[PDB]
Amino acid sequence: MKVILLEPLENLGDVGQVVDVKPGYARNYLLPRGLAVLATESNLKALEARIRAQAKRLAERKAEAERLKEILE
RNA sequence: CCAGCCUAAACCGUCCGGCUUGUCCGGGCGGGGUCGUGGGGCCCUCGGACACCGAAUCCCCAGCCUAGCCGAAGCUGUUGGGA
Ligand SMILES: [Mg+2]
Ligand SMILES: [Mg+2]
Ligand SMILES: [Mg+2]
Ligand SMILES: [Mg+2]
Ligand SMILES: [Mg+2]
Ligand SMILES: [Mg+2]
Ligand SMILES: [Mg+2]
Ligand SMILES: [Mg+2]
Ligand SMILES: [Mg+2]
Ligand SMILES: [Mg+2]
Ligand SMILES: [Mg+2]
Ligand SMILES: [Mg+2]
Ligand SMILES: [Mg+2]
Ligand SMILES: [Mg+2]
Ligand SMILES: [Mg+2]
Ligand SMILES: [Mg+2]
Ligand SMILES: [Mg+2]
Ligand SMILES: [Mg+2]
Ligand SMILES: [Mg+2]
Known part of the structure; x- marks a missing residue:
């Protein structure tokens, strides 16, 4: 099953990654112990x-320190 | 015998709570949509209100069921217990 782990996992990967693992593993460990979430089309x-x-949150925080770059120099 | 309709989804709006506050996610309500000569949604050009079609829902009556009522024309003999 496709899942989305919200935690730095060893064999799996870093947070926010999407990785397919054996159902039971996610159904009876990850998902239950709140390590990941079923990667439905909704999620x-x-x-x-x-x-x-x-x-665009940091892309705009850099687009703003872009004006200070033009003038403070 | 006779007849065809409603909805889910896209898409627009709202109220609620969840949470990593986000142009979001889900739930409920409303609008939209309903088809095979393919249809619908959103974006453009146009004439439609006063146009027409119209119930399987509601309303009035007719009629009918549940009691009834009117309704023509004869009398004398005669056998017989009795016409
Ligand atoms: Mg949904
Ligand atoms: Mg959605
Ligand atoms: Mg509806
Ligand atoms: Mg929806
Ligand atoms: Mg929804
Ligand atoms: Mg909604
Ligand atoms: Mg739904
Ligand atoms: Mg519904
Ligand atoms: Mg509707
Ligand atoms: Mg429309
Ligand atoms: Mg409709
Ligand atoms: Mg239409
Ligand atoms: Mg059909
Ligand atoms: Mg089309
Ligand atoms: Mg009519
Ligand atoms: Mg009546
Ligand atoms: Mg009567
Ligand atoms: Mg007599
Ligand atoms: Mg007599």
């Missing part, structure tokens, strides 16, 4: 938000 969408949001 993948809510992940595009965390990506795009923080993206």
Whole structure:
């Protein structure tokens, strides 16, 4: 199953990564112990938000320190 | 015998809570949509209100069921216990 781990996992990977693992492992350990979440079409969408949001969030914080770069120099 | 309709989804709006506050996620309500000569959504150009079609829902009556009522024309003999 496709899941989205919200935790630095050893064999799996870092947070926010999407990796397919054996059902039982996620169904009876990851998902239950809150290490990951079933990567449904609903969650993948809510992940595009965390990506795009923080993206233009720092992309705009650098686009603002872009004005101070032009003038303070 | 006779007859065809409603919805899910896209898409727009709202109220609620969840949470990593986000152009989001889900839930409930409303609008939209309903088809095979393919249809619908959103974006453009246009004439439609006063156009027409119209119930399987509601309303009035007719009619009918549950009691009834009117309804023509004869009398004398005669056998017989009795016409
Ligand atoms: Mg959904
Ligand atoms: Mg959605
Ligand atoms: Mg509806
Ligand atoms: Mg929806
Ligand atoms: Mg929804
Ligand atoms: Mg909603
Ligand atoms: Mg739904
Ligand atoms: Mg519903
Ligand atoms: Mg409707
Ligand atoms: Mg429309
Ligand atoms: Mg409709
Ligand atoms: Mg239409
Ligand atoms: Mg059909
Ligand atoms: Mg089409
Ligand atoms: Mg009519
Ligand atoms: Mg009546
Ligand atoms: Mg009567
Ligand atoms: Mg007599
Ligand atoms: Mg007599």
